[PDB]
Amino acid sequence: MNREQVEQLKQEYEEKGYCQIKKIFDFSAIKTIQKTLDQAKQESQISKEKVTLKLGGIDDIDTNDHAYDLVKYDFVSSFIQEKLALLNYITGKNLMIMHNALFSVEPNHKGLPWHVGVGSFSFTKTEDFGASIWIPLDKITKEHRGGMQYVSTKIFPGQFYYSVFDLHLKNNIKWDESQGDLNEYVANANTIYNKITEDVIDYTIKDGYEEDEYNLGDAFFFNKYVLHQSVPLKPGLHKLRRAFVIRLVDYDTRVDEERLGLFSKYSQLHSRYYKTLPRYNKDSVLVMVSRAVQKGLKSPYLRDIPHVQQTLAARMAA
């Protein structure tokens, strides 16, 4: 790339926790992602419950697509691996391709609410690394928006949010028949997580958030402590805007068996009360990890999980 630009990118990420990377992918790569993911999407049937559980069962998720792991590590590596160098550099870490997600919003929808990566990186240790590449598959413009807003970790150091969240989850799990509707309980529980409302977030960050425009081929890179949300799409441009999102970890990122168990317990409890059937894409990262943990782990590191270890070369820089 430019070299001077690659230096500004490193610099920015080091200050904010994130950076917009312009023209990192080519229109051919974008197109292949559009087709592959459209096809994948057409085959499976997917609910709003696993994206809801991930952000704490709060049920202010207003997206259209919220699909996890529609495509495998090998498809992703195919266009991502040649980029891991730039990212490893920008972050000074050693990045592994892990799981992914497809999100879409229709005009006049809230999409995702303010949040940090505590849902996305639930099965890993809070203090171990995590970052994401958000690839918009539909143009984000000044007049129609529908993009994202994001806040410098300088202004809002999201790491603390992970603890508040876990306290909230621990409370979810204390739910009872006697308590009434599960979702209503979870939503009016007087936890700390529940006091942190959009009014409070706004008061905390003021106008410190940023919101950029994106032509196809641009992407947004951000660590798991960046507070971010979807912005509503104004009508008259896209019937639907999609983003494909790649989750990355570090060579040394370890599994957090404890948070993992909390989620399973909450998920379990929820689907039992609501008679629902959570479906997970064979080769979902979450399922793979859950099993390595339920067998018992020989090591703390993700890299040493059988399947990850076998496919490791494809997941990391060349």
Place this chain on the structure above:
Amino acid sequence: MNREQVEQLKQEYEEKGYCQIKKIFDFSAIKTIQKTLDQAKQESQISKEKVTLKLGGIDDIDTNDHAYDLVKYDFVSSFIQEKLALLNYITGKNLMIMHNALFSVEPNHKGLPWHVGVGSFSFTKTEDFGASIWIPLDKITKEHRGGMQYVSTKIFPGQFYYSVFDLHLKNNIKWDESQGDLNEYVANANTIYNKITEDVIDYTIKDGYEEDEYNLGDAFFFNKYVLHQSVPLKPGLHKLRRAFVIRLVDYDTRVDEERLGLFSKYSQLHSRYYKTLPRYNKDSVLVMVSRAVQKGLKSPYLRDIPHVQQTLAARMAA
């Protein structure tokens, strides 16, 4: 000591982040602290503002005495240094005596509200070790209470509270004439800190807290992430109950110039608006550190501060 007891202490601290240590001091030592501190207390004139600033300007501080560094490191060492070995063991750290405080409450006062050590260890980095010894100078009984309540870090991991507080502090410091009375600004500001009310704390911990009885000679030992508060003193026993508190760090604990700076800016802003004159006991640790930092630090480590370095042996285990 017992040996089998010392293992139950180390064990308990490893789970809860604290432990009651029975009969760790002798009545003779207690009497010396009582006398020394009463003389020291009698000499100076002390206000409620520096303890109000230390818990974020929230003005729910209901103590009688709230005096920092009435006595120097050498007095403290004189009865503490022979104990550092037991603490060093329990915590697997290598402790340095630093600063101290004296708190007292009259009957039917709230004393200090739920808090962590974020005010007390303001000038040190969050992730660096901190702990305290709380020595009741007046008996704490089941019938009159007046002691403390404390929560296991397993139930309330208080490290997250440091960022929440820092966010609040940052807001404090954006205060403005146009905003009206500073203290009301700080207390009604829609920060996350202000959202965590006693109700929220109660909902969070439930009955997880503990509250022990204390004979003179007993002490309570806890790291800076343990949530704790004063319990009201029922009348008919003490006119006033005092506690002397010793603050400890690790050999490798570092200064945090950034928090230190926020604190001074808020302190300064406060004394300006209210026309007040903060007084600091000569050889206050806060002032000693503030000066090193203002001159510019050669090292991040507290131990490498010049006054600390010179007096380092008095501060650590034999």
